[PDB]
């Protein structure tokens, strides 16, 4: 169902094309089964942030607590993104998702 799988243990930076926009996502996992269940869960996490851009709060998934954060994207004017001929519009904020286990 989902798009590309995640580095589970380690930090990663993911660019995402959604509507006419490019989102910069950074994922961090703290003190930490079935690959695509986790993929779908982190994707669901992204979609949630993407649907609450100005209304960020920590949430609980099946396995995790996601604390999304939003920082200015420094030097975005320096970058152009294209999908073939189509200009993609950068959302000029970095989303950092800090993912902990619920326990």
């Amino acid at each position: 169902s989902s798009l590309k799988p995640f580095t589970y243990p380690f930090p990663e930076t993911r660019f995402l094309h959604a509507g006419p926009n490019v989102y910069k996502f950074k994922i961090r996992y703290g003190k930490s089964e079935n690959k695509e269940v986790i993929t779908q869960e982190l994707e669901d996490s992204v979609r949630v942030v993407l649907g609450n851009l100005d209304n960020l709060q920590p949430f609980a998934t099946e396995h995790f607590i996601v604390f999304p954060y939003k920082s200015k994207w420094e030097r975005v004017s320096h970058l152009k993104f294209k999908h073939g001929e189509i200009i993609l519009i950068p959302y000029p904020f970095v989303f950092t998702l800090y993912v902990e286990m619920k326990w």
């Binding site: 798009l3 590309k4 993911r14 660019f15 995402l16 094309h17 959604a18 509507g19 490019v22 994707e43 669901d44 996490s45 992204v46 979609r47 949630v48 993407l50 649907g51 609450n52 709060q57 920590p58 949430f59 609980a60 998934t61 607590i65 996601v66 004017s77 320096h78 970058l79 152009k80 993104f81 294209k82 999908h83 073939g84 993609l88």
Partner: protein, 36 residues
């Protein structure tokens, strides 16, 4: 005390792709002030 369930969080329901430059027609460009 307790965090909101993802189930109660509204979410973006659209097509969503990894922007991977050099893939699926995707290209990224960095401003320069020198040329070669």
């Amino acid at each position: 005390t307790g965090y909101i369930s993802i189930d109660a969080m509204k979410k973006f329901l659209g097509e969503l792709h990894d922007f991977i430059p050099g893939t699926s027609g995707y290209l990224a460009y960095h401003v320069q002030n020198e040329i070669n």
